[PDB]
């Protein structure tokens, strides 16, 4: 019970109201394995998409709940969204958290899943920290309740207890769709324009491999891959269900930090959620020969289709078999600014 009194006194600048949370250790195992993170608040809207200011959230792991029903970490969700009077709530409304120790993993959370659980729960001098004074006397079991989490079908534990007028005005709040809809269809729009760029690049060229990366290939490659077997290039667009782990937007945010590359890897036909957004280096003295070795090891991955994005406005597709199809990247800077504001600061 430390991070709640940490962030409660901290975020008084950009947030009127602060909600406190638990996060179980099973619910973020598919987010980041091996306990690699240890945050940043940016709650986007449902139909009032735009852009909003960011707020920092502090947290801790490895410290156990008073409930022995599950044993996990500490988080907390700021709420600052409602204009003027905070009595209205935005329904069907995402609130993004960027839990991190060094920006890996995201945390999408709802206002219904938060507040329905919240209602379900309920010669001079030094001045004292005022808000910590009421948490020590509570120490009770009814303050924490189990909430069916909507993004991942699991339990997310909230903590709240009858503090004061900020949390007292919270439990009376109600009000009279499209917050998970917009980001996915926006990903499919940029994926369709990139696949259209690949279509027109294969059309204006002879529909032929230039083979930018060198591999040796067997003579039965037109047999063990069938004729025109682009069924993986076909269902590429459904397979990109993630984007901000995907390397495609990673090059656009990398414009603020010249010879850099990011690589997505998707398997040959559904071997699993392989990886998204790995790094090809040119800065350290491993050098361009090490970049070439990693690149040809990328190209010899005979069961994974790779997509290459550059920083300068160019896209590339790597067929397994060393074949490369060139492509453009040129997107409207409104979506660019929307992406870099969705992650961080312009």
């Amino acid at each position: 019970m430390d991070v709640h009194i940490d962030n409660q006194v901290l975020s008084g600048l950009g947030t009127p109201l602060l909600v406190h949370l638990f996060v179980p250790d099973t619910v973020m195992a598919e987010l980041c394995p091996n306990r690699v993170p240890n945050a940043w608040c940016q709650t986007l809207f449902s139909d009032r998409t735009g852009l909003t200011r960011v707020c920092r959230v502090f947290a801790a792991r490895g410290m156990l709940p008073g409930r022995p029903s599950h044993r996990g970490t500490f988080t907390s969700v700021p709420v600052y969204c409602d204009e003027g009077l905070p009595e209205l709530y935005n329904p069907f409304h995402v609130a993004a958290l960027r839990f991190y120790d060094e920006l890996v993993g995201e945390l999408q959370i709802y206002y219904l899943s938060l507040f329905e659980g919240a209602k379900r729960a309920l010669l001079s001098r030094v001045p004292v920290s005022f808000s910590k004074t009421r948490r020590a006397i509570r120490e009770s079991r009814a303050l924490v309740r189990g909430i069916a989490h909507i993004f991942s079908p699991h339990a997310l534990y909230v903590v709240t207890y009858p503090e004061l007028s900020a949390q007292g005005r919270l439990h009376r709040m109600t009000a009279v769709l499209g917050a998970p809809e917009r980001e996915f269809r926006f990903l499919i729009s940029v994926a369709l324009r990139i696949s259209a760029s690949f279509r027109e690049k294969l059309a204006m060229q002879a529909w032929t491999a230039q083979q930018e990366i060198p591999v040796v290939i067997p003579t039965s490659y037109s047999r063990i891959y069938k004729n025109s077997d682009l069924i993986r290039e076909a269902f590429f667009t459904v397979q990109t269900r993630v984007s901000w782990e995907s390397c495609w937007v990673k090059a656009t945010i990398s414009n603020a930090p010249d010879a850099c590359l990011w690589i997505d890897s998707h398997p040959l036909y559904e071997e699993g959620a392989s990886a998204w957004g790995k790094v090809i280096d040119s800065r350290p003295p491993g050098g361009l020969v090490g970049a070439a070795s990693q690149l040809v090891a990328l190209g010899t991955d005979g069961h994974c289709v790779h997509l290459a994005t550059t920083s300068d406005g160019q896209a590339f597709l790597v067929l397994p078999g060393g074949f490369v199809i060139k492509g453009q990247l040129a997107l409207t800077p409104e979506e660019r600014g929307y992406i870099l504001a969705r992650h961080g600061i312009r």
């Binding site: 329904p91 069907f92 009279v176 769709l177």
Partner: protein, 35 residues
């Protein structure tokens, strides 16, 4: 003389119930707008 006002606060409870049952009435209409 000793049974005059308790009937009236009974009707006041019926009035608060017939008022606050509207909060039950409009939520499934909100569901019909939503889902």
């Amino acid at each position: 003389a000793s049974r005059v006002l308790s009937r009236f606060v009974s009707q006041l409870r019926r009035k608060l119930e017939r008022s606050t049952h509207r909060l039950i009435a409009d939520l499934e209409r909100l569901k019909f707008l939503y889902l």
